[PDB]
């Protein structure tokens, strides 16, 4: 509802950060 929506809008947690960090790691590892 409105409360959860507000809380999440405020926190802006990057829940997908592990996906990005993992893709990025792999990307730079492969330039060898």
């Amino acid at each position: 509802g409105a409360m959860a929506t507000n809380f999440l809008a405020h926190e802006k947690i990057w829940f997908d950060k592990f996906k990005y960090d993992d893709a990025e790691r792999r990307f730079y590892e492969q330039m060898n």
């Binding site: 409360m3 959860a4 929506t5 507000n6 809380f7 999440l8 809008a9 405020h10 926190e11 802006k12 947690i13 990057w14 829940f15 997908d16």
Partner: protein, 215 residues
């Protein structure tokens, strides 16, 4: 009805989805569950364009029939996969079903959610969230208790969408916070709740349900 078949979009262990899943156990309808997550974009929860095409409110549960019929809102989905008996066989019974469904949504869902999960309400300045919700729930169980004193189910003489809906709305409370010393006062409501969740149609969706122990 028995012939309805389709895909129910939802995350698992969702009491709102449970309403349609349990109804389908009674009706014979074939409801399969697809649990694809939403996207989290910088504080915002979003769903795919295809999903929003069929379900513009972007909420789950949502249902797409194998013939392409789309419907959202957990009550409407549960209505659709139900049969005439669960919906109410007469305008009287049907109206009574709409009554308890509506009562569940307006009066039970808010304090039930708040008592089991008070964190958000407290953050938004509902200081006494827990004690306030506990009193509302006490009033609700007492209302059901008097009504069920002389009745097996809420409407007529068999399970309808009324029972399914109110049970699902009470499910977390009975699991998480309705202690024996608290629920003791509502033997009627407890009996009706136990009689519902122990039926095979409820059991198939809910599994074995452990009632809250002393905390």
């Amino acid at each position: 009805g028995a012939m309805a078949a389709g895909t129910l979009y939802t995350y698992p262990e969702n009491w709102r989805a449970f309403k349609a899943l349990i109804a389908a156990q009674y009706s014979g309808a074939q409801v399969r569950v697809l649990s694809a997550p939403p996207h989290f974009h910088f504080g915002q929860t979003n769903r795919t364009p295809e999903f929003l095409r069929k379900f513009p409110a972007g909420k789950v549960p949502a249902f797409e029939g194998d013939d392409g019929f789309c419907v959202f809102e957990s009550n409407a989905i549960a209505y659709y996969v139900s049969n005439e008996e669960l919906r109410g066989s007469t305008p009287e019974a049907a109206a009574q079903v709409v009554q308890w469904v509506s009562f569940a949504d307006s009066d039970i869902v808010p304090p039930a959610s708040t008592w089991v999960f008070p964190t958000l309400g407290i953050m938004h300045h509902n200081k006494q969230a827990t004690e306030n919700a506990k009193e509302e729930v006490r009033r609700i169980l007492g209302l059901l208790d008097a009504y069920l004193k002389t009745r097996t189910f809420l409407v007529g003489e068999r399970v309808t969408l009324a029972d399914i809906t109110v049970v699902c709305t009470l499910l977390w409370l009975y699991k998480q916070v309705l202690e024996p010393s608290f629920r003791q006062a509502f033997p009627n409501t407890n009996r009706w709740f136990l009689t519902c969740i122990n039926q095979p149609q409820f059991r198939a969706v809910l599994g074995e349900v452990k009632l809250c122990e002393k905390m």
